[PDB]
Each structure stands twice: as structure tokens, then as C-alpha cells.
């Protein structure tokens, strides 16, 4: 059908004006290179989400009760039918297959539901179907817990695509992050399914606390993996053995993926440097001033980095070219504000245990202000005939 050939093939056009020779880069290649960057993170996330579910299920149930539970859920009996096993010694194959059966429905639902609105708008306004949804859909499907209902994911992606992105004019015209706008819609509308201890480990009847919110209770000594009984170390939280969403669990994979797109120039290193500087400064100020009743005042920078969705946000979600600043002088300020706001929401605000998604949305509002400040300074320098 024509909907496939027009995607695979290049249009085969020629230049007719101005620069008769053009650069080989294009939006399709940019979006595809970003889409491929999250593949190692997604694969390790699927593996870890299978492993956590298997471990929690084995810790809770055993024997006949375990068989009754395994025969009552379609993820478990599909994993058992496809050759996998739910025993205590399941291999990486089954640990990845269970995560796949937990993640693929969410990705398919998000893709189809968002693409419907994308096609509808780009057909009504007589455009050609753009790209960037290939990135938005995968980021949204990676930043949600494995147990999120499909009817909630559909509404989240609907809000993110329609209200936040498509109303303003489509790709390259919006001012806010679409994936994070949808996630914030879900976060504020249905907070029982995106918070608590029941949503991170995809096991039936198992309640396991957030690795980030286990710190606010008792400090570094309170970090424990109740699924297996072991304690979470920095190496575990860095490699990505902690419970969490599909996407942001692994940090080594995120660094590996984001190094390529930083090298290729798609993602700016200025925003990443600003985020790092802000986080380090604020999270060292908090340690220096100290506190007695708050246990997050003593969390250092290298523990802020590994836990939560900090790495995923900083690498893949804070570097959105459209939402970020357009000035090399304002990109540093944008990154510093993002890092400072994330650390502040983590430490001082008690209602929300994680604040990267809200910090990015807050800095998206004030990026144009930084752009205006720098451009006004440049104009005032021009008026002195020195520019």
C-alpha cells in the first residue's frame, strides 16, 4: 500500500533555489536515530521487569497456590505456554518474555491510539504525516509502570498528543513536552495507579516500596529488596536491578544509548552539563546544611543520579530541541534550572517522591524567558555598533 512505500522510499526531489546542494541529515533520520537509542534500555527494562515479577511471585506463593495463581493471569500462563517457566530458577529467556508480555500491549496501545489522532489532524489540515511520534510513543511507553491499564495509557497519550502537541500545529510548533504532558495528566488524574508500593513490581498481591521513597523513610540503611531479602547497593541501583518502570531502571544502558546521540550532535551536551551542575550544587548544599528529621537531606549527588528517572529524563527527555532553549547561553540556564528543580522536588516536597517529570515541565515554561533575556542583551550590544 502507498502508506508504506512513501515511508521507506526517499522522495527523490531536486533543489531549485538558493543552495543547490543540501546536507544529508533529515528529520526522519534524526527521529529514527533517537528511536533506536532507547533499545538497550528497553531490553534491560523488560528483563528486569520479568525478573522482579518472578522473584516476588516465588517469595509470596509456592506449590499448589503458586500453580493456581499462575493459571489465573494471562501473562503468567502465556509465558508458561510459550516454553517459559515461572519457577525460582527461570532463565533470562523467561525473564525477558514476561517483561515483553507486560510491555508490548502498552506500546501497541499507545502507538495506535496516538497515531489515530496524528493521522486525523495531519489529514484534516492537508499535511503529510510527520515524524516524532515514533519517539513520543516509545518514551511514553517507557516512562510508565508495567501494570498501567490500557484504558489509562490510551487517555494519557490522547491528552499528550492532542492538547499538548497537535493543537499548536504539530511537530516543531509546540512549546511543551508531549510525553511528559501525558504522564503528568496521568499522574494528577489517576494517582493510585502511578504511585504507591503496589505498582512497581508486576506481581499479584505483592507490595514493594519505591527504591527512591525507601530512602525518605530511614536513609541508606532502609534500602532493602523485599522480593529477595537482599539490600540494594549502589552497583545494583546503577546497573538497574531496582524495581521501577520499563525505561529508566537501567542507568548504564541509558548512558550507553545517550553517548551515541550526544556524539552525533542530535542531543545537546549543554543541557546535560547544566542538569549535572545544578543537581551537584543543590544536593551538596543540602548535605552541608544537614537535617535531623528529614532523611533526604543526607542523600549525595551520586545517589540522586542512579535512583529514579533522573538519568532517563536528563538524557532523553530534557534535551527536546523544540521545548528547550534556542540559545547556547540559555541552554546552560535551562539545564541548571532543571537539575535544581528536580533536586528540590525530591528533597523538600513530601507528597511527590519523584520530581524529574515536573521539573522538566517547569523549565519548559521559563526557557523562552531565558531566550528573551539573551536576545535582548544581544540587541543592546548591537545598538552600540559592536555587533
Amino acid at each position: 500500500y502507498e502508506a508504506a512505500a512513501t515511508l521507506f522510499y526517499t522522495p527523490g526531489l531536486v533543489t531549485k533555489r538558493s543552495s543547490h546542494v543540501r546536507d544529508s541529515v533529515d528529520l526522519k533520520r534524526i527521529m529514527i536515530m533517537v528511536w533506536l537509542a532507547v533499545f538497550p534500555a528497553m531490553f534491560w527494562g523488560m528483563y528486569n521487569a520479568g525478573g522482579q515479577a518472578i522473584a516476588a511471585l516465588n517469595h509470596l506463593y509456592s506449590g499448589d497456590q503458586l500453580a493456581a495463581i499462575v493459571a489465573g493471569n494471562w501473562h503468567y500462563w502465556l509465558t508458561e505456554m510459550l516454553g517459559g517457566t515461572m519457577s525460582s530458577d527461570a532463565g533470562w529467556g523467561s525473564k525477558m518474555l514476561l517483561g515483553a508480555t507486560y510491555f508490548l500491549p502498552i506500546y501497541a496501545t499507545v502507538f495506535i491510539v496516538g497515531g489515530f489522532w496524528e493521522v486525523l489532524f495531519c489529514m484534516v489540515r492537508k499535511h503529510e504525516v510527520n515524524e516524532g511520534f515514533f519517539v513520543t510513543s516509545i518514551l511514553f511507553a517507557l516512562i510508565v509502570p508495567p501494570t498501567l491499564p490500557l484504558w489509562q495509557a490510551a487517555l494519557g497519550i490522547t491528552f499528550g498528543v492532542v492538547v499538548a502537541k497537535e493543537v499548536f500545529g504539530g511537530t516543531g510548533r509546540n512549546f511543551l513536552n508531549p510525553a511528559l504532558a501525558g504522564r503528568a495528566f496521568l499522574f494528577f488524574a489517576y494517582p493510585a495507579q502511578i504511585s504507591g508500593d503496589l505498582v512497581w513490581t508486576a506481581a499479584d498481591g505483592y507490595s514493594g516500596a519505591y527504591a527512591l521513597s525507601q530512602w525518605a523513610q530511614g536513609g541508606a540503611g532502609a534500602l532493602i529488596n523485599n522480593a529477595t531479602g537482599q539490600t540494594i547497593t549502589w552497583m545494583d541501583a546503577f546497573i538497574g536491578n531496582i524495581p521501577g518502570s520499563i525505561g529508566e531502571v537501567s542507568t548504564l544502558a541509558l548512558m550507553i544509548g545517550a553517548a551515541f546521540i550526544v556524539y552525533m550532535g542530535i542531543a545537546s551536551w549543554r543541557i546535560i552539563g547544566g542538569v549535572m551542575i545544578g543537581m551537584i550544587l543543590l544536593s551538596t548544599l543540602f548535605n552541608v546544611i544537614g537535617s535531623d528529621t528529614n532523611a533526604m537531606f543526607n542523600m549525595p549527588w551520586h545517589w540522586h543520579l542512579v535512583l529514579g528517572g533522573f538519568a532517563f529524563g536528563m538524557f532523553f527527555m530534557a534535551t527536546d530541541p523544540v521545548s528547550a532553549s534556542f540559545t547556547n547561553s540559555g541552554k546552560w540556564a535551562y539545564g541548571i534550572l532543571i537539575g535544581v528543580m528536580c533536586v528540590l522536588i525530591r528533597v523538600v516536597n513530601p507528597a511527590y517522591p519523584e520530581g524529574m517529570m515536573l521539573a522538566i515541565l517547569f523549565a519548559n515554561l521559563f526557557a523562552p524567558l531565558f531566550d528573551h533575556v539573551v536576545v535582548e542583551r544581544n540587541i543592546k550590544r548591537r545598538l552600540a555598533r559592536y555587533g
Binding site: 522510499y9 538558493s18 543540501r22 542530535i266
Partner: protein, 446 residues
């Protein structure tokens, strides 16, 4: 010594060999009518009229007093009119040697002429059209004077000629032209040049300023931004080295000098070199038997800011000093965007081509992609050496804003200064025409 840090030396194949050789005999010239900004002609000649050299072809209605003259003596053959009866070109068949003769001056007396006496001779001879005023790139008004004239004297365009080769043949004419410009300026003459040596004029008004770096260093806009910033209250004239040689020869001999040394080079040329030609020649018979078979695009100027030479426009421009030929790319390719290209060029590091240092590409006319919205990954900031906000200025131009574009600095720029920004745009936007529309709106709202 002024060093430019940002830019892009375009690695297109077929670089010319800087040796001047005689070109093909040219039996037809033309003087275009779509390259002069805001020029509304009043034709003084008709098809079949016989014209001498330096005899006026048409005047201006928006710029009274400026006269455009015939490069060679012959018979007019075409007055081609485009859409809405716009003047595309006036074709003259060179069939004679008669000419109009002007006054002659000793080489010593050229530094003390009156400005009005210089202006009258320049306008009568037709060399007044060599100058251009930044902003708006219009031909200078007959009675206007500026205190800064920027003799380019350097070439950094892709597949461009080396001015040191051309000037050393005409050192005396170049010196005399510099003396005339120093007597005419009333300010200073900024003779931009590379680190190599050039003939020197013994005048205090003339300054030699040395530039360096990649392509945008050899642009009159960059020279003005770095030596004499321009605005609505400060206009500066611009001129190249060959027109300076023409001015010197005019004031030394009394006859207009209509020779040229252009560089015929490109990916699809058998033997790139410098060919001695005539002003406004016919490219269709200039490039015959010099091109490999197949479909080709012949350009009158650099591939970054040239003009396609097909049909009525298939003649050399006034301000262009090189002819570039490259193949036409029309075929599609399956999964071309996903290929880890070794032969593909990009300022970004997303292709395997950039790893191989020193590679030269056989670039074609394809737009590698399709028209989309602008996602500013940071390509314009890599290739803009000026003190501006590029990705804000281009968004201002695309949105149609004019006053804010002026505030951001659109006046100092020309269509030739946004060629690299158009080149490195993932959205495949053409910014030169947007800037020209913006400047036309600014001029009208005067």
C-alpha cells in the same frame, strides 16, 4: 589578522587548477534583468537595433540616472519577457568592434579627482552597477556617498578562483582602481585579503585587512560586520577585485574593460580550470565539449548561492565570477535514510563519511529528505561566525516578522550570507528568499 572559527569548507570534488587558459570563442552575450534588486527597466533599444560597446540598453525608474550598458558591440536579438512581462535578459550578438570612448587620466592624477567627476564617468561607462549598498544590496543611488567601500579581493567559495593569480596579471590596473576608490570614498577603503601579498596603493585611506578561516570569511557581509557594522544610518558599498581592475583600466585607458577570468569547475567537468571569458557570456556555448555526458545542471556562481543557467537565464551574471556544473539527482533509493553512508556528507557526525578525513564527494542537486517543520538541533549555530542569534533570526524570518528581524540583525545580511544556513537545515528551508521578502517589506515600509 582576524580569524573566523565557525564555518564549513565544502568538500565538493572537481577543484579547479589555478592556471589561466583561453576559453571558447563567444558569439553571444546577455545582460540579465532579474539579478539587480528592485530594478524596473526602461528599454531604450529594440530587437534588431545595432549597439556599440558601452551604449545604454535601459535605465531605471526606481533609481533614476543609473544606466546599464552593453558589454560588446553587436545587434540585439532578444528582449525575453517572463511572467507579468518581467525582463529576463537582453541578448546581444557580438558582431563588431566599435565603442564609446571616455576621458583618459595619467596614473599620477587619479588620486586627486573630484568625486562628482569620478561619478559622472563611472555612471556614463556603466561601472556604477558594480557597487552594492549594504543593507538591501541595491545599486547605490547616483547622488549617494558612503564612507566605507569594501574591496573583497578574496575568494573562499566552493570551487572558486584564486584572486592572487588574477591580480598579478593586472597589478597596475588594480593599483589605479584602488587609488580611484580612495579618492571617491570620502571615508576608507577596506581591502580585505588573505595572508598572501597583493599590490599596494600608497594612500592613507586604503587599508589591507587579513582574514582567515573557512568559507564565510570571504564574504563582504562578514567583512562589514567585523570592520564597519552597518545599519539604516550607515550604508557601506561593496565591490570585487575584477570590477576594481575594470575601474582602473577605464580610468587609465578611456575605454571600458569587459574581460573576465572565471573558474569552470565541478564534479562533472572533464578538466576544471580558469577560463578567460567575456562579461555576461553565453554559458551554453562556454561549457560545450567540457562536460561529461548525462543530465547536468549548469550554475552561474557557487553551488551555495548561484543561479541555474537554463533558457533565458543561461548567461553569466554581473556579480558572479565562476561557473559550477554538477549532475542532477532524480532517482529514489530504498531505505536511503537508514544507510550508514560512507559517501554522504553532513556537518553532524551521524554518517560514516565524516570519519574518513580528506574525502571529496561527488555531490548532486538532491534535497536529502523532504520539507518538514524546523527542529533546531543546533546546525545553524555551527556555521554562523557572526555575533547573532541564528535559530531565532531564521524563525523570525519564517514567521514573517519584519521589525523583530531588523532588531535581531537582518539588515546586515544578504541572501548570500544565509546559504550555509539553508544548506545545513534539516527542514529543507530556503532562507535567502525569505530574507529578500523581509527586506522588500522593510524597504516599502520606509
Amino acid at each position: 589578522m582576524i580569524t573566523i572559527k565557525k564555518g564549513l569548507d565544502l568538500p565538493i570534488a572537481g577543484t579547479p587548477s589555478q592556471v589561466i587558459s583561453d576559453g571558447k570563442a563567444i558569439k553571444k552575450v546577455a545582460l540579465l534583468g532579474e539579478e539587480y534588486v528592485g530594478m524596473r527597466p526602461t528599454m531604450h533599444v529594440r530587437v534588431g537595433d545595432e549597439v556599440k560597446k558601452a551604449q545604454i540598453l535601459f535605465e531605471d525608474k526606481k533609481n533614476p540616472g543609473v544606466k546599464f550598458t552593453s558589454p560588446v558591440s553587436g545587434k540585439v536579438v532578444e528582449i525575453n519577457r517572463g511572467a507579468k512581462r518581467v525582463l529576463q535578459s537582453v541578448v546581444i550578438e557580438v558582431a563588431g568592434d566599435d565603442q564609446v570612448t571616455f576621458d583618459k587620466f595619467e596614473a599620477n592624477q587619479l588620486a586627486s579627482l573630484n568625486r562628482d567627476a569620478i561619478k559622472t564617468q563611472l555612471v556614463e561607462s556603466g561601472l556604477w552597477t558594480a557597487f552594492r549598498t549594504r543593507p538591501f544590496s541595491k545599486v547605490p543611488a547616483i547622488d549617494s556617498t558612503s564612507e566605507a567601500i569594501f574591496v573583497t579581493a578574496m575568494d573562499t567559495n566552493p570551487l572558486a578562483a584564486e584572486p592572487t593569480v588574477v591580480i598579478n596579471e593586472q597589478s597596475e590596473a588594480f593599483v589605479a582602481g584602488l587609488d580611484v576608490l580612495s579618492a571617491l570614498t570620502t571615508g576608507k577603503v577596506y581591502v580585505c585579503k588573505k595572508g598572501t601579498s597583493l599590490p599596494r596603493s600608497q594612500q592613507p585611506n586604503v587599508e589591507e585587512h587579513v582574514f582567515d578561516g573557512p568559507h564565510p570569511a570571504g564574504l563582504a557581509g562578514t567583512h562589514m560586520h567585523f570592520l564597519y557594522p552597518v545599519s539604516a544610518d550607515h550604508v557601506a558599498w561593496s565591490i570585487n577585485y575584477q570590477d576594481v581592475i575594470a575601474v582602473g583600466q577605464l580610468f587609465l585607458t578611456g575605454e571600458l574593460y569587459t574581460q573576465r577570468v572565471v573558474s569552470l569547475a565541478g564534479p562533472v567537468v572533464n578538466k576544471p580550470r580558469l577560463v578567460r571569458t567575456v562579461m555576461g557570456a553565453s554559458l551554453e556555448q562556454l561549457v560545450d565539449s567540457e562536460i561529461m555526458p548525462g543530465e547536468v545542471r549548469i550554475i552561474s556562481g557557487s553551488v551555495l548561492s548561484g543561479t541555474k543557467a537554463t533558457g533565458p537565464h543561461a548567461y553569466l551574471g554581473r556579480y558572479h565570477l565562476q561557473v559550477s556544473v554538477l549532475r542532477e539527482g532524480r532517482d529514489k533509493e530504498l531505505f536511503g535514510w537508514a544507510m550508514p553512508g560512507k559517501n554522504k556528507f553532513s556537518v553532524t557526525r551521524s554518517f560514516l563519511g565524516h570519519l574518513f578525513k580528506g574525502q571529496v564527494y561527488n555531490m548532486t542537486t538532491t534535497t536529502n529528505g523532504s520539507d518538514r517543520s524546523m527542529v533546531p538541533i543546533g546546525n545553524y549555530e555551527k556555521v554562523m561566525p557572526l555575533d547573532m542569534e541564528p535559530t531565532l533570526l531564521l524563525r523570525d524570518l519564517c514567521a514573517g516578522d519584519s521589525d523583530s528581524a531588523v532588531r535581531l540583525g537582518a539588515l546586515e545580511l544578504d541572501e548570500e550570507d544565509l546559504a550555509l544556513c539553508t544548506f545545513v537545515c534539516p527542514g529543507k528551508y530556503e532562507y535567502g528568499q525569505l530574507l529578500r521578502e523581509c527586506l522588500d517589506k522593510i524597504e516599502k515600509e520606509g
